[PDB]
């Protein structure tokens, strides 16, 4: 079905997001923000729905996304959390933008009917 194949494409996009060639800016997003290890006493005040690439992977494998647009929304929640929490000139914001640039171009170009 178109949905199952578009989800497969989403896995492939996430796999590229994890690949070495994008690591220099993607890596802050590989895993949940460890608020305790980092001592971020204000993170949970500001970010009500944390998201990261490993969690998105787990949700795809547990079939939690109805379709590619629910996958995309979680990817964009990731980036939004980073834009919301950090100062706009912070290194991690630029890093999020560079990774978002890759994600948006791949996500936009995904076939509308990949099963065909």
């Amino acid at each position: 079905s178109k949905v199952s194949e578009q989800l497969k494409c989403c896995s492939g996009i996430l796999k590229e997001m994890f690949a070495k060639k994008h690591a220099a800016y993607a890596w802050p997003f590989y895993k949940p923000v460890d608020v305790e290890a980092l001592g971020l006493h204000d993170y949970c005040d500001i970010i009500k729905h944390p998201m990261d690439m490993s969690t998105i992977k787990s949700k795809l494998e547990a079939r939690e996304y109805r379709d590619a647009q629910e996958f995309g929304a979680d990817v964009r929640l990731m980036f939004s959390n980073c834009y919301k929490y950090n100062p706009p000139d912070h290194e991690v914001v630029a890093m999020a933008r560079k990774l978002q640039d890759v994600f948006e171009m791949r996500f936009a170009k995904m076939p509308d009917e990949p099963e065909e």
């Binding site: 690591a23 220099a24 890596w27 802050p28 923000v33 980092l38 971020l40 290194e91 991690v92």
Partner: peptide, 12 residues
């Protein structure tokens, strides 16, 4: 600090 392999980044 966040860490991944040879990379580090101050978030706090």
């Amino acid at each position: 600090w966040k860490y991944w392999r040879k990379y580090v980044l101050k978030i706090c």
